Amino acid sequence: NREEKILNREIGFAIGMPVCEFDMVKDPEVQDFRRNILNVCKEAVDLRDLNSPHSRAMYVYPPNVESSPELPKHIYNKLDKGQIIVVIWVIVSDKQKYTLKINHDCVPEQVIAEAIRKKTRSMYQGKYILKVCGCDEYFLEKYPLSQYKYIRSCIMLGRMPNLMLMAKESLYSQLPMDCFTMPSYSRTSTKSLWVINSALRIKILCATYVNVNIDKIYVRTGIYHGGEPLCDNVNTQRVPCSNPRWNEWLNYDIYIPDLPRAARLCLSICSVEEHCPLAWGNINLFDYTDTLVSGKMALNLWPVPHGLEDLLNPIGVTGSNPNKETPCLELEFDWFSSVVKFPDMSVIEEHANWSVSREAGFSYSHAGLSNRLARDNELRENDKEQLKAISTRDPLSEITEQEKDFLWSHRHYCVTIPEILPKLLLSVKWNSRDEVAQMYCLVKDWPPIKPEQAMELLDCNYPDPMVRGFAVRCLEKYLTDDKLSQYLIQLVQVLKYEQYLDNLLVRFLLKKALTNQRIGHFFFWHLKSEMHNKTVSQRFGLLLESYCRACGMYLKHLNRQVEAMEKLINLTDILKQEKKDETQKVQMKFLVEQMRRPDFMDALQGFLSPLNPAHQLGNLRLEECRIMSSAKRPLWLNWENPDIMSELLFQNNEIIFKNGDDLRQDMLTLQIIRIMENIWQNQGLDLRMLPYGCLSIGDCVGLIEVVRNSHTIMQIQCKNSHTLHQWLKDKNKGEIYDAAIDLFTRSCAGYCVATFILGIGDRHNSNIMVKDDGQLFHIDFGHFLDHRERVPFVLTQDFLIVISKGAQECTKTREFERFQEMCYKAYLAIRQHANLFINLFSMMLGSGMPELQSFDDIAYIRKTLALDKTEQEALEYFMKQMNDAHHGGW
Ligand SMILES: Cc1ncc(-c2ccn3ncc(-c4ccc5c(c4)[C@](C)(Cc4ccccc4)C(=O)N5)c3n2)cn1
């Protein structure tokens, strides 16, 4: 009791709302989620206690590894006959280094042995472990050394890997034994939907809290499966709005047995001609227990989002508005003197088998009645090619009603080309129980597809729980922890599309978060960052509760980060509101005084970076901290790295704290840049990008990683077109000059292509940066997509002079020709992976990012990548856009 009350206070602090507010929720789905989700918590904790203490160390410090053990060709050529130089440090009480030359695919135990041999020569293996010097990353698992991300980065960047030898007992002692306690809250016939001979009818009674300045109003309604209507929309009779009452039964063109599992009532109160929506709301026609909704219901509605022309909002969240001081539409559903439940799978399978059997016995003339019917023997070779051709089309490509009939009719052949599944599912008649039942049985036995292809089936086009269950099973089987970490933002976002709180996706994500602390860390922060959003605050709040009960000791470390962030929010809010007009000098005096307060100073020191929890943030170097003069006035913050071997990585950790701007756009752009870079490297195309760390922690508040040893193009030129080339020539004298120009041209090529494809905000001297070694990169990816196509990054003469090595006619050179060749190969490489990028954007539609509101916004990428065109026409398109932007050259 006392232990639980203390734990509840900690969880309450982590999530930003008290636990007791969840206890007060009457909704049975909420209380059932809280109870039933603890099974996932139990399972996760058992795996942690399985092979203790190693399994606990693997949870807290998981291997930061790539998915593939294999290496590219150009990366292997940087090695010395398939070998790497590695420095292994040993602390003695002084720092003793031991330089080893070993095979890139050596196991940590072999690496430790070779270090002990060198120590012996100067005058056992299983008692030690390797730690990365300067941060809390360990090599606890027997992987090839090159598969560890730190090591592969050192090879690619041409740096020396510095590891530290540490005793196993030193690490294991630092990890406390967590004790997961189960909380206190853990303690008329029934007929099928299919035996109901009746059409769908819903009564609209009346609205309350209809506060407006607007002649008459009406309740628009519709029956939807995802974004797709299952019948025509039905309106009520018009009413002045002075009196909001109707009491009118709306009749829909759908037979009750034909209602699919994920069917939803979508509605809105509108005003008139120029029709305009006032408030909107969506309801699941079946509840979480598979029961059809019956009797009276009251739905609090939402305010209309900005820029939405449509009267209904089908893809908007389902369920009632938490704010009860809002338009509250009263509804009544039809009653059938019994509990109406959705039929179970055995009944569905029986009917599917019955339909399949009947269809196989259809004559030529019967099959001829419908283009959705087709006999098995009539499947020709040209049809098989057409199906194959349809499967290679991108997700935004239109599937015609003819192609839908075609796809459905050959659905059994579609099993042999399993990547076509998304196309087949949109060809299904979701308002026909005969078809849907057969689709379920095909989905049940459907072959496994790649995680990236499965991810599409979790977006807003695929609401059916069998479809989404199949997708989750593909992730469980094939998604690596590396790729899960990479796609975690998308997977968190598609939780919003789930009909119910308890589902297969959230169970999969929670288990991974509770068996891998690196995943758990960002899982927590992605959820916590949107707790202000009342669309998702209950779902995310309840999910966070279940995480915080089972995550173990890390809750306390998370609470250090939460308090640190809250203190920075509080200080920046005061500077923004109270002391915005004052000078840099006076604001800094206020800031230093407030931070040096006893409670603030402890809160802002000695915690883990939310950008990367392997980085320890020690004491604040307040002398190095700065308020910057840019928009929103971000804090440049500087902490000591308290790691014993900090000098070998970095002595100071610099982070930008920014309060006022939305950073979710930047997060998505930075993720995509990293994926683009990854595709280029695997294709033998070394275009070095700089996807700096960026984490939204809240409503228009977040953290940004500082790139060390970097300057803006304005900072170069301010101290003439040759100034930039002269700066790099001065910074890289002698033999290393060519490496700098080569790094500049390669990085410049990557950013030219990447920014053009994505439609990033206009580039200029203040938001383009360059490192000392020549590495060019961009900052502030505030806007993207169609915010005709644009060229955001225009290579002015400054940049072209660097590529051509100080030549006057830089446009006509072999260096520029090679730079163009990099851009063409880079552009076409991304073209081949267009589905991934389209899907990654499609999974983010549910977020409230104003640049990504509909599928029309994502269609910008279809234009920039030229997907309707051929590969040669795509190059010619790309060249034309570059030529017109630069006024000749391409
Ligand atoms: C004069 C000057 N000095 C230093 C740097 C500077 C130096 C290094 N790094 N490494 C990352 C950034 C970085 C990343 C994203 C974003 C930003 C900065 C700003 C622009 C915020 C901001 C503006 C001004 C100063 C610092 C931050 C934003 O909005 N997004 C950065 N910046 C730039 N310009």
Nearest-angstrom CA–CA distance, 424 and 447: 14
Q: Residue 844's beta-bridge partner residues?
A: none
Instruction: Tell me the residue type at 785.
Output: L
Phi-psi region of 81 (alpha: psi -120 to 50; beta: other; left: phi over 0): left
Q: How far is the centre of ligand 1, averaged over its atoms, from the C-alpha of 591 (Å)?
A: 20
- Closest residue by Cα to atom 23, ligand 1, is 630
Task: Look up the CATH number of the domain holding residue 752.
Answer: 1.10.1070.11
How far from the centroid of its chain's Cα atoms is residue 132's Cα?
A: 28
Distance from Cα 668 to the centre of ligand 1, integer Å: 18
Task: Give CA–CA dist 497/461, Å, rounded.
Answer: 9
Q: Are residues 866 and 760 in the same domain?
A: yes
Q: Are residues 269 and 410 in the same domain?
A: no
Angle at alpha carbon of residue 747, lines to 741 and 748, rounded to 5°: 85
Give the technique used to solve this structure. X-ray
- The reply to whether 854 and 870 lie within a common domain is yes
Same domain? 811 vs 881: yes
Whether residues 336 and 387 share a domain: the answer is: no
Distance (Å) from CA 879 to ligand 1 centroid: 31
On whether both 307 and 425 belong to a single domain, the answer is no
- Same structural domain, 479 and 525: yes
Q: Which amino acid is at 407?
A: L
Do residues 331 and 356 share a domain? no
User: How far is residue 275 from each of residues 239, 279, 334, measured CA to CA in Å?
Assistant: 14, 13, 29
CA of 297 to the centre of ligand 1 (A): 51
391 and 333 share a domain? no
Q: Examine the domain organization and report whether 349 and 337 are in the same domain.
A: no
Residues whose beta carbon lies within 6 Å of some atom of ligand 1: 628, 630, 634, 636, 656, 692, 704, 706-707, 710, 712, 779-780
**∠ CA 624-629-634, rounded to 5°:** 65
Q: Could you tell me which residues come within 8 angstroms of residue 299 by beta carbon, excluding any fewer than 6 positions away? A: 267, 281, 283, 320, 328, 329, 330, 331
Cα of 807 to ligand 1 centre, how many Å? 31
Question: Are residues 327 and 474 located together in one domain of the fold?
Answer: no
Same domain, 310 and 391: no
**Which residues, at least 6 apart from 324, have a Cβ–Cβ distance to it below 8 Å?**
300
Calpha distance 712→637 (Å, rounded): 19
Phi then psi dihedrals of residue 367, to 5 deg: -50, -40
From CA 209, how far away is CA 673, in angstroms rounded? 47
* Residues 552/180, Cβ–Cβ less than 8 Å: yes
- CATH number for the domain spanning 217: value is 2.60.40.150
**Structural contact between residues 403 and 409, judged by C-beta atoms closer than 8 angstroms:** no
Say if residues 172 and 57 touch (Cβ distance below 8 Å): yes
Pocket mutation for ligand 1, best pick of 708, 715, 779, 783 (most atoms within 8 Å of C-beta): 779
Three-state SS for 679-696 is HHHHCCCCCCCCCCCEEE
Which among 266, 270, 277, 275 is positioned nearest to 299, based on CA atoms? 266
Find how far residue 878's CA is from the centre of its chain.
29
Question: What's the token pair of residue 393?
Answer: 């089309």
> What is the extent of the structural domain holding 495?
345-554
Is residue 217 within 8 Å of residue 241, measured between CB atoms? yes
Give residue 14 CA to ligand 1 midpoint distance, Å. Answer: 29
Which residue puts its alpha carbon closest to atom 29 of ligand 1? 780
Resolution (in Å) of the shown entry? 2.2
CATH code where residue 506 lies:
1.25.40.70
